[PDB]
Design a binder for these strands. Sequence first.
RNA 1: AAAACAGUGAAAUUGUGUGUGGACCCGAAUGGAUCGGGCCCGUCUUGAAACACGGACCAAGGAGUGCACAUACACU
Lengths: 55, 135, 182, 147, 55, 327
Amino acid sequence: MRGNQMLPNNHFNKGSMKFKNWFNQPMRALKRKEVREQKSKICYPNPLKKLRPVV
Amino acid sequence: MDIVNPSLSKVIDIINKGKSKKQFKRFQSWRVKRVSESWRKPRGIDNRMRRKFGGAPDMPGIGYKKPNAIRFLLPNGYRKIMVACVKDLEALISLNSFYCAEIRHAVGSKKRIEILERAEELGILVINKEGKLVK
Amino acid sequence: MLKQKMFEHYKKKAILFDESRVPRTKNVFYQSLFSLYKKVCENTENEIVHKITKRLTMSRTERHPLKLSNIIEQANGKEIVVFVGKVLDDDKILEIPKITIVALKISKQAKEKLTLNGGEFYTLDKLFYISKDLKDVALVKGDKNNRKCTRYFGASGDKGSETYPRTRKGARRGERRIKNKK
Amino acid sequence: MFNKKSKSRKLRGHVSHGYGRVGKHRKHPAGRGKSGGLKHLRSLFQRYHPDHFRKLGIVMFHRNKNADFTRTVNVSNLWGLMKLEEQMKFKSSAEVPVVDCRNYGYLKVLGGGDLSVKKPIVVIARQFTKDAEEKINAVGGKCVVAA
Amino acid sequence: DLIAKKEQYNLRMEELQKKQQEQHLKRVEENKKYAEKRTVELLETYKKIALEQQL
Amino acid sequence: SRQVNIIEQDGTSSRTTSVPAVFNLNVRQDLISFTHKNVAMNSRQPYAVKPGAGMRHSAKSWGTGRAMARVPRVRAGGTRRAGQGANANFCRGGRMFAPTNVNRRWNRKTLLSIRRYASAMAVAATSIPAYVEGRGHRIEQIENIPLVLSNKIDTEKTKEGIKILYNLGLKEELDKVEESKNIRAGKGKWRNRRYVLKKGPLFVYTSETSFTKAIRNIPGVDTERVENLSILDLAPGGQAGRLIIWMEDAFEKLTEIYGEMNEESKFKKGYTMGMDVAENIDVENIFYSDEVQEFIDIPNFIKKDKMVMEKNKLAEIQQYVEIEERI
RNA sequence: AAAACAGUGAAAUUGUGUGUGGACCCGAAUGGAUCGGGCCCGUCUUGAAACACGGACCAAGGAGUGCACAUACACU
């Protein structure tokens, strides 16, 4: 270690650590859209969401 | 082919006889077959060529570069341009005083005939004129 | 006699444009403007023109910005002011004197304020129309030393040093300045 | 520039990759992490980080950020919270503006500079400095404390 | 309009170039005549200075 | 500014329209290129080698004293594989240096304000003949730019659709695309990228119409909506000035989308159309103005000759004569 | 473990024929004997031609990379 820096503190020591990637993000968005649409048919005239209070 | 640029006709032989024939072979390419002839600079701690002892060969460098006017000039006194279409010759129409054309190797016989016919009427020198089309 | 002649020559050569410098931007509108000034320099000795041409070649960080009130503070009673940089609004001020600014760029909120109070913004291509003999102009400059990152330059473990340590920071955590004077 | 070639590509053909022939490039010649700081690295610490090896201050085992979070404004900036079109109305008009700092997320008022326009103003906040109060009262304005 | 004004500059400068050139040759010719007379003077004053020492 | 003529099915023109304000904006080939580079990287799929390839076998070093290099070697018997060199990157069947890995950063960010500005000045370039010709679209036969097709196009069949496009002068452009089809050079021809074609006209619509499915099978025709017009379609390969067929509704919408000069767009919140540091590329010509020519000073054209020191040449510049005096 | 097309068919290495030399390189030449200069590379080292170590020969493979966190510079 040489020169002037903010002293390190990077937590990568643990060999059992898992990584999570997000390559599925656009596809899972499309599935959530298609589930709402079909749910909306099952109860056609009624809104999909209920009324809620203000706090 | 025996042709010359008219602007240099009385000078071309002085120019040609003045060009160097030096080669810069890689060090020890004469000793083992696994080292090719292509130049690489020696970087050893002990190396006799890097240290420039008398009796070792010479190294490339800027001093050997030719005058700016003579450089790139073919032995007929022209510079060269590559062509592969009829529409390429159209570029040379202003430059034919100093430049000549060389048809690319992959252009086939039937097409070459069409290039040469156009070259004749525009007045452009083609240096591969005989080419494959001798038969 | 000779010693004076020599020094007066050095002082001059220290002002004039170098002519082996060029701006690094690939912006063709910026490179157009530099070409004009360059062709003016080789036909004049006037110090304002030489100063302007040298500043167009400096980096984004060297062209540090100024706020409207600081221009007025440095204008020192002149009518026209010139600035190779961007002019920003000062939220602390509303009324200003009537003034003409020739500069590289201006922010939306600054331009409105300048206009409401009476006054004009012109780009640096127009300088020669705004002024006839460059006697009524002031030239103004920012300072890159005022960046917040300059507080960390140097060593905090020197005696009497005013510099700040690079540190983690929280409600309790953080390294202090301990070798300064108060 | 937006793109540039790297240094590694120029070092092809040069033996040591720029680490030296005598010194070389070994695995960890000085130790791992920020260790050694009271020993062989004492000179780095005493030059750049002198307040590292210490314990300091009062301790609360749990703290809440929301209960202590605040943001501060100076008197010279009060008129600046209004939009520029709004500023230019109240400057000429006979009416007095009523500015509430809570609406812009400010809770404390400080005494820096002079007021932009020397006409009355009503300022609502949670706390005022002694200098701020005197300056606002000087122009015939009023300070109103509120939650 | 400026493309037309560019021509007036080129014309004006050619006149100025021819003018300055003519003024230069006259200086060069003037200088040659002064130089002839002066060299005859100085070669004689050396001769005088030498006799002063012999005396 | 100008009016522009609308074109009906039969090629007649009668009604006319003003031109949107976006078309007066100057063009920055630096920013168009930068934006193209970043956005083009957002469509990639990840690739990597298998997570422990090259490391399967039971291997150990033999250590010194055996007259062999101390590489790990394969433990086996009965096969020629016994004693061969195992795990390292310099070994046949070993593990590669720094195996490629899924955690790499595939996409790239670009500020929303730059994306908006780049698309605005790409749209502008679609109406300068120099740029359109420069991309290689051929427009010798086209009467005027831009083209605006009317509504009340009642076309449903490709047969009648082509007849319309021919009447606008596009024949040579379309032919240039059809004749272009060729098989790609290199390994890409194995990986589902077999044929390459030249780019042609883009059609831009805003309102749903039958004309869209009448023109689409013609090679090199491309279609997009005005409200979601992309820089990949407007500046292919990062060079600007694609030829565009506007629909009459779409052309009027450009005023709502980009607004007016020194105003704020209602459709794009927080965005306004700005000013360059100089108005034109021609500003070098200001030198010849009256105001400048009064300011400067008269040049000196007379210049000194280079120093010469050769015996004979020097003797004609300085004729030396001896003297007898001894003073 | 090895082993694709009954394609193309490099180098190391071998036989036959024709030429030029007696380890070979650089500079300069003859009809013709040759003249002058040159110790074996890579590497640690105050110091290598070394009685310091690695290298029989040819092809193909073969070593500053990716992510996180602060940072200075250039560009928007």
